[PDB]
């Protein structure tokens, strides 16, 4: 996989060149903003269970057909599989946040997910709804001004939202 740093290095190698001052400055900036990134990952991870469970409950309340006999999340086996997926998606999203690059998410999680749900008969559109729910909750927790040194993490929240949307698009 790749993180924000390896990404720049790979692009440079393909061109056979050393990094420019602008590139060094860009990566230097990322390091300067590192604390915020760590806080976001810690905060989302520390509330992973609630984020998944709250989103799941909301999903089933809004889309009751999923939990009616015959529904795709009916039976404990399928419900467990569904909850597992939400946790898995949230897990890879947080990996992407730490890396500052979506590569790990695209490669080890989203790749072929579309096709998987299609073969199983799982409604990807509903999965996307679940992902969107975790996104809103994850960002609310990560960007909670309470209990942390005040500062602006808007760009970071924008980046985080991008990964969630990326996952939502890959399955919807």
């Amino acid at each position: 996989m790749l993180d924000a740093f390896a990404k720049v290095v790979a692009q440079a190698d393909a061109r056979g060149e050393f990094l420019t001052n602008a590139q060094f400055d860009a990566l230097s900036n990322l390091v300067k903003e590192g604390n915020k990134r760590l806080d976001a990952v810690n905060r989302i991870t520390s509330n992973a269970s609630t984020i998944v469970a709250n989103a799941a409950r909301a999903l089933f309340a809004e889309q009751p057909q999923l939990i009616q006999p015959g529904g795709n999340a009916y039976t404990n086996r399928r419900m467990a599989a569904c909850l597992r997926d939400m946790e898995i998606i949230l897990r890879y999203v947080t990996y992407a946040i730490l890396a500052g690059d979506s590569s790990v998410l695209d490669d080890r999680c989203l790749n072929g997910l579309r096709e998987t749900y299609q073969a199983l008969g799982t409604p990807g559109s509903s999965v996307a709804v679940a992902i969107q729910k975790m996104k809103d909750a994850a960002i609310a927790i990560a960007n909670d001004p309470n209990g942390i040194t005040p500062g602006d993490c808007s760009a970071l929240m924008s980046e985080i939202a991008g990964y969630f949307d990326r996952a939502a698009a890959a399955v919807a």
Binding site: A6, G16, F24, V31, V41, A48, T94, Y95, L98, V104
Partner: protein
């Protein structure tokens, strides 16, 4: 690519778990050390040409036969001299990538993998590259932790050739 960050998430992924404080501290260590690593990377890049030129001559001085011996694997022709300067530049570029990434990943993937096969097939002597790397280490001009960073990756290359 091997970096403290991809390594941290690779560990959590293989364990099928969310990142823990254990991995977060690792990444912070990398973020803090980045200050010295970036300083080293910028310096080596800034002085890349002189380091490459000086390293090439160091090899030719240590191994005079490489400037006169007949054969495409030697630097006894303009093409061979160019191939050599090219290679030395590749090594230096790789060390800067390692410093930028905070790990050996860049060098491991683009240069070390297949290195032994290459040197054997084209009759290139590891000792030549070791001498060039020793020159870079002795003359990069860095001090303090920036020098510690540069030397760690230079020595990693030397070890890969030994």
């Amino acid at each position: 690519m091997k970096t403290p960050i991809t390594e941290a998430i690779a560990a959590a992924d293989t364990q099928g778990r969310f990142l823990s404080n254990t991995e977060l501290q690792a990444v912070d260590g990398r973020f803090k050390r980045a200050v010295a690593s970036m300083e080293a990377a910028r310096a080596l890049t800034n002085n890349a040409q002189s380091l490459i030129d000086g390293a090439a001559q160091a090899v030719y001085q240590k191994f005079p036969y490489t400037t006169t011996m007949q054969g495409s694997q030697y630097a006894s022709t303009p093409e061979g001299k160019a191939k050599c300067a090219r290679d030395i530049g590749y090594y230096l570029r790789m060390i800067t990538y390692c410093l930028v990434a905070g790990g050996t990943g860049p060098m491991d993937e683009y240069l070390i993998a297949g290195l032994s096969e290459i040197n054997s097939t084209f009759d290139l002597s590891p000792s030549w590259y070791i001498e060039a790397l020793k020159y870079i280490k002795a003359n990069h001009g860095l001090t303090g932790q920036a020098a510690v960073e540069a030397n760690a990756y230079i020595d990693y290359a030397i070890n890969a050739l030994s």
